[PDB]
């Protein structure tokens, strides 16, 4: 029997709920952090190393955890996935301020101190942010591939990922129209070596029983476009024979009438009658995925047909080239060659089937890091280095403040130390020794020394090419501080239940 509804008890319960929601996702921090399985409730368990996804799929019942996870989601929708460094940071702020609240410090004093410390840190970070945007990035991008391949060093993948980074950066440059992760993806192809994997400027989907109608389509056709169909193409007692015959006749006639090159439908196509479906004289498809559709009308320009024999000029319209090849021994589907093809789907050719998760956790950050480096100019060292620098500034400045805010700003500064600690703990190397050495060498030697994820030692992340834009870090820190102050400001909760 444990209850808490008064002001201070309410605050301590709320920040304990924040503690538990942080513990739920604490260990996933870092490029090579732990991974978690969560069941969806019907048996389709989900596995994902991402931190934001865990919060998205997590059920939250506590109001404090609810508002914290809403702040996290708000952070997610703006810039990448900083939620890992925000939920954890805010929750450990609350954990650090626990005893001061317990001793009777008024929450308004805490909020004022935290806001002052946040303003000081955001103002102080801008004197350290360094821009290398001009220094050989768009032209002579060797620095940009250096930063990209920094992501997965100390691996045998480095030889292949060098070419991988060069080629994906080529794709980004030729599609530098604010690319997202929706228009760019990876498609698993069984077999082959890692070096065999390539890129195609179009969709890539395997043909199944219900997916493709017939082979030997006119691949080298100079103007193939997409056709969308909402009517079935499949095959009083005798009163349905004539209707079925007429339906089949008009379905066969429509393909030649409208002249559609490839027809995409939301219905299965029977490959047991492959020759029967080949009588249309033109290629027809069914069971198209939603992503495949969305990637084909905004690039090629496919039309929509809803009638039995609907005709349009966008079934055989203007698109560059059609591709249909047996990639890896299996014939895939490629709606490439589009006038405004903002599409670069990565052909994942590899032997092991489990390498899909490696690509999920390995290359979507590489495209993410290169896009982040391109979009912004000024960056600071990562791996917790900037957190230690901010902690040093704030801890040293706190002792110059007479008044209650001194202890609180000191607690905020020492709270800022969690990120390097969490990184090195997820790496498996014990946090105390590495963190102490980092603190000493960082308060003395340099302003950018940070944890190394590979050799487990103090590494100059600036010269290691670990770039984090100043604006993204600023926004993440501000959001975390705002969440902490918002939780602190709450002292009473009202429910008003049904019965």
């Amino acid at each position: 029997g444990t209850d808490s509804s008064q002001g201070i008890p309410q605050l301590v319960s709320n920040i304990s709920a924040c503690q538990v929601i942080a513990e739920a996702v604490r260990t996933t921090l870092g490029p090579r952090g732990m991974d978690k399985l969560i069941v969806d409730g019907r048996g389709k368990a989900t596995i994902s190393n991402d931190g934001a996804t865990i919060l998205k799929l997590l059920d939250v019942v506590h109001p404090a955890a609810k508002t914290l996870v809403d702040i996290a989601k708000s952070q997610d929708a703006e810039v990448g996935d900083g939620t890992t460094s925000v939920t954890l940071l805010a929750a450990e702020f609350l954990k650090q301020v626990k005893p001061y609240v317990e001793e009777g410090l008024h929450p308004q004093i805490i909020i004022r101190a935290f806001r002052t410390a946040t303003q000081l840190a955001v103002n102080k970070i801008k004197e350290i942010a360094v821009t290398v945007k001009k220094a050989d990035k768009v032209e002579q991008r060797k620095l940009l591939e250096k930063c990209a391949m920094t992501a997965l060093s100390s691996k045998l993948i480095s030889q292949q990922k060098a070419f991988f980074a060069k080629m994906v950066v080529d794709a980004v440059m030729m599609l530098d129209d604010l690319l997202q992760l929706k228009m760019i993806g990876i498609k698993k192809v069984q077999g082959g070596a890692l070096e065999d994997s390539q890129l195609v400027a179009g969709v890539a989907f395997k043909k199944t029983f219900s997916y493709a109608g017939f082979e030997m389509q006119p691949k080298k056709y100079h103007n193939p476009k997409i056709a969308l169909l909402n009517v079935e193409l499949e095959l009083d007692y005798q009163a349905i024979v004539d209707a079925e015959w007429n339906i089949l006749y008009d379905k066969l006639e429509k393909i030649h009438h409208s002249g559609a090159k490839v027809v995409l439908s939301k219905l299965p196509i029977g490959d047991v009658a492959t020759q029967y479906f080949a009588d249309r004289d033109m290629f027809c498809a069914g069971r198209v995925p939603e992503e495949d559709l969305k990637r084909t009308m905004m690039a090629c320009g496919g039309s929509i047909q809803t009638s039995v024999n609907a005709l349009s000029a966008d079934v055989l319209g203007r698109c560059q080239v059609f591709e249909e090849t047996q990639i890896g021994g299996e014939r895939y589907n490629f709606f490439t060659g589009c006038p405004k093809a903002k599409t670069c789907t990565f052909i994942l050719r590899g032997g092991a089937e489990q390498f899909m998760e490696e690509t999920e956790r390995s290359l979507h950050d590489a495209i993410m890091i290169v896009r982040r480096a391109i979009k912004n100019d000024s960056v600071v060292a990562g791996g917790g280095a900037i957190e230690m620098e901010l902690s040093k500034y704030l801890r040293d400045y706190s002792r110059t403040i007479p008044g209650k805010q001194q202890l609180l700003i000191g607690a905020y500064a020492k709270a800022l130390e969690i990120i390097p600690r969490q990184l090195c703990d997820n790496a498996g190397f014990d946090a105390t020794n590495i963190l102490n050495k980092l603190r000493a060498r960082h308060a003395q030697g340099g302003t950018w020394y940070g944890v190394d994820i590979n050799n487990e030692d103090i590494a100059d992340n600036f010269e290691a090419f670990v770039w984090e834009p100043a604006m993204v870090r600023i926004n993440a820190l501000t959001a975390a501080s705002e969440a902490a102050c918002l939780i602190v400001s709450v002292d009473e909760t009202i429910k008003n239940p049904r019965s």
Binding site: L105, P402, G403, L407, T432, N436, A440, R441, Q444
Partner: protein
């Protein structure tokens, strides 16, 4: 349920410290100690509290033993050492909980203690020289503050400091030494204390001995005795032959504790001897050690050169009271302070304040090395040790950091018992001491402590709140030793 017996020891220590925490400082609250048979005891200082508290936990017994041992060294800081040890135990327990082995914690604590005792030795005060005048004055006033006599504080202050300085000895080692019992009290009737003048020698307020003492006699020899010169019925009647023999040996001023002689008047104009009833033993021993004479139980027999000497004797009336001016003897022990007023009862707080001022002056006179009080030194070392720890880089960084953080409990407790929020006082102390090192020009700021009367930061080198260096050094050493002994337990 229960586990990690180390935490149990730490909690026992924390409880023991919390029993005595609130009594720290001159303004501490009292504790009422109840025994099995029901008697009660009221006291302020926690030394007797530990000496009287019924300890039962084996871990707490170690702290009690170490505090008692600390009492045997200098007799102060037992509350402070217990509180510091408890804070160290709590912080070390937390460090253990965060996966730091106690061995590294112990090593860090040892290094922190050594660094603290080295840092303090180069930031203390040895200005208790002949040029230290105002510091002693306002130290006496601070020990005498919050009293109605603050209107005329300076006169009593300079009087008492002159009295204490003029009577100093010089021992075998050459270190000046002061007996508190050397100076005594002397009441007077009539005008108030504002006209009290320091008496250069011991003065007794009793019947007038004789008028035969000149304005200043060339030789005044103290032939003190202990019998009553009374006619009875080397002499059967001890009135004439023994006094004649002692005068032949060269006795100028024969002291008689008991009754006066019947015919002393004729003998006191040719020899000038003393006859006043009820000579106090406390003052008799002091005057004997001053002039150098010894008390003679019997005279029937060494007596010529062994007896003491006095430079001059003055017969005068002070505050409508005749006093005997046996002053300027061989060794400076003979001195008294006249308490002008009406009775000692209405000026009980006045004489008690004078006594405590004399005590706080003699604390700083001996052990010429002195440090500021009022939590100044704790804040200074707390600032020092964090910067010292951040330059190590070993596993002992957190140990020294927590040592520095826990060292602030003494000023915090002092502020708490002073009815001010300890947060503001501690923060202000730390802020003042921060610029004491990061700003070299503001070097004359280390001696900033907390004032218990007003609850605001205040310089204590100028104020006079002072402590012997040995007391704090031993307190820190013993707290570290107790903490290490507790952490070694498992």
């Amino acid at each position: 349920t229960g586990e990690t017996i180390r935490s149990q020891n730490v909690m026992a220590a924390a409880s023991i410290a919390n029993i005595v925490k609130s009594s720290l400082g001159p303004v501490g609250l009292d504790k009422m100690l109840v025994d099995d048979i029901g008697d009660v005891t009221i006291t302020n200082d926690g030394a007797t509290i530990l000496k009287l508290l019924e300890v039962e936990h084996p871990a707490a017994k170690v702290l009690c033993e170490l505090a008692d041992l600390q009492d045997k060294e200098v007799g102060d800081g037992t509350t402070s050492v217990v509180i510091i040890a408890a804070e160290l135990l709590k912080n070390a327990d937390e460090l253990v909980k965060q996966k730091i082995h106690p061995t590294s914690v112990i090593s860090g604590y040892r290094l922190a203690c050594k660094e603290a005792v080295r840092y303090i030795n180069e930031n203390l005060i040895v200005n208790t020289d002949e040029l230290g005048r105002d510091c002693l004055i306002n130290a006496a006033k601070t020990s005498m503050s919050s009293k109605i006599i603050g209107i005329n504080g300076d006169f009593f202050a300079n009087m008492v400091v002159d009295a204490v300085l003029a009577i100093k000895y010089t021992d075998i080692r050459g270190q000046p030494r002061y007996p508190v019992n050397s100076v005594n009290i002397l009441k007077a009737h009539g005008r108030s204390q504002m006209e009290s003048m320091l008496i250069s020698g011991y003065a007794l307020n009793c019947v007038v001995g004789s008028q035969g003492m000149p304005k200043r006699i060339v030789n005044a020899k103290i032939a003190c005795l202990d019998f009553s010169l009374q006619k009875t019925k080397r002499e059967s009647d001890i009135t004439k032959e023994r006094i004649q023999k002692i005068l032949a040996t060269g006795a100028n001023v024969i002291l008689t504790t008991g009754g006066i002689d019947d015919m002393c008047l004729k003998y006191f104009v040719e020899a000038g001897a003393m006859a006043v009833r009820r000579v106090l033993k406390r003052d008799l021993k002091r005057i004997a050690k001053a002039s150098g004479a010894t008390i003679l139980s019997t005279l029937a027999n060494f007596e010529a050169a062994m007896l003491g000497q006095a430079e001059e004797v003055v017969q005068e009336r002070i505050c409508d009271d005749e006093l005997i001016l046996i002053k300027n003897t061989k060794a400076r022990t003979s001195a008294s302070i006249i308490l002008r007023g009406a009775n000692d009862f209405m000026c009980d707080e006045m004489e008690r304040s004078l006594h405590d001022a004399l005590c706080v002056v003699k604390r700083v006179l001996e052990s010429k090395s002195v440090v500021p009080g009022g939590g100044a030194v704790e804040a200074a070392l707390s600032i020092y040790l964090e910067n010292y720890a951040t330059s190590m880089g070993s596993r002992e960084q957190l140990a020294i950091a927590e040592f520095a953080r826990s060292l602030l409990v003494i000023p915090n407790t002092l502020a708490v018992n002073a009815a001010q929020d300890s947060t503001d006082l501690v923060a202000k102390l730390r802020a003042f001491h921060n610029e004491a090192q990061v700003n070299p020009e503001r070097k004359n700021l280390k001696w900033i402590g907390l004032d218990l009367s007003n609850g605001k930061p205040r310089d204590n080198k100028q104020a006079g709140v002072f402590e012997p260096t040995i007391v704090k050094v031993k307190s820190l050493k013993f707290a570290t030793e107790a903490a290490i002994t507790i952490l070694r337990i498992d």
